[model samples]
Target: PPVAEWAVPQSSRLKYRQLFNSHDKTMSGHLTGPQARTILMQSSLPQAQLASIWNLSDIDQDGKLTAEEFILAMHLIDVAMSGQPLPPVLPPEYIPPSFRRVRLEHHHHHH
Candidate 1:
């Protein structure tokens, strides 16, 4: 079945949503790559690893992050900080709601 709820904790999501709003300097409801990179770099992870997470979480390849994608990236940062290697792919459950809807609409196209 498709994932309906975010796998990230509610508390964490709320916090990240607040964070996202503050950093959305353009007030466009999304963060540009540079904006997100600044926040994600707060983690001790190497640039390569951070880049991997960015690529995975930018679900539509739009070079910006919605609030949900920001939350997912933060969750992945937590996972990496806990001494786990980054997953080769973003887990199905972690895909943001908007991207999931896009996938459902284009169900016939396989990546």
Candidate 2:
């Protein structure tokens, strides 16, 4: 099954996926920090808010964003744009599917 199927609404996920592909020129399956920053800037949110969102979406703390992370960032952007406050941490429901999978695998290995 597709990981994104339940993570974001269908239309919105499709839109984000297209945007991600356009900006992910390296075809590396992830966006570098600067690349992601450029797209996040389009949200027009204050730098502080954007910074918080970046931290939240970069679930792996790797300074880059996978497609799942990019979609998660877009969702957070939408939340901030709607006049709601950004959460101190990303809600469990918003954690990217890939990140969740990675975490599970890591736990399995650590055991």
Candidate 3:
């Protein structure tokens, strides 16, 4: 057998949910970025999803994410999940391509 060259991106939301549940000891709120990293790494969520997850989490239109924002994204699980109509911390800048555009109900699809 040949050595693996690259990682495979997580193709299902269930896996992400399982990873989050496994990592989150306190279900009251979201886990921190480091926790997310550890969990995703354990779950083998593909390097691309690891980065895409952060980009997908950046709300408030700020173009950047703070720790709180990252955690919030984890709890909320999606940009719209906050349900505040406006990001409490940063405000989203770009349309996020899929945000509020697709018919996603919860945990939007990631490629």
Candidate 4:
């Protein structure tokens, strides 16, 4: 119920969850999200996927990854791998009542 491993990566569910929590904190000052580490760990994503994320933007692989670099990396990877762009990261609060019709409409337009 607490931990499971897939593909035999050098991480447990808890370790991956910790990394994701840190990644979220890096991206948006929050440490919680849906899907947990299971999805993120098994995304078939590259290290560049992490590099391209807002949490991983940095010139020196220093702790200074920028939004633009992250965005660019995501776009590049998606285009190269899937002929598409990466999806936007949804906020932790995007649900039901807070996910208003207008908000959904705007997101649909972007998609």
* Candidate achieving the largest TM-score: 1
Task: Check candidate 2 and list the clashing pairs.
Answer: none
Clashing pairs in 1: none
Q: What tens-digit string does per-residue lDDT give for candidate 3 at 1-111?
A: 342211212232345445455555654345555655564455444466456555556543434433334443443343333343433333333222334354436876889
TM-score of each: 0.79, 0.79, 0.32, 0.26
Writing each residue's lDDT as its tens digit, candidate 1 over 1-99 gives 443377777777889888887776656787888878889988878999888898888877888878888998988898888887777777777776557
* Per-candidate clash tally: 0, 0, 6, 4
lDDT of each: 0.81, 0.80, 0.44, 0.37
lDDT of 2 by residue, 39-109 (tens): 99988888988888888888778898878889889888998878888777667676754566554353345
Q: Where is model 3 poorest over a 10-residue stretch in terms of lDDT?
A: 3-12
Could you give candidate 4's per-residue lDDT for residues 1-111 as a string of tens digits?
A: 332322212343235345444556555632222322233345567656543443422223334322333333333344446646544553322111321233224334553
**Highest lDDT, which number?**
1
Between candidates 1 and 4, the one scoring higher on TM-score is 1
| Winner by lDDT between candidate 2 and candidate 1 | 1
**What CA RMSD would candidate 1 show?**
5.2
Model 2 lDDT-worst window of ten: 102-111
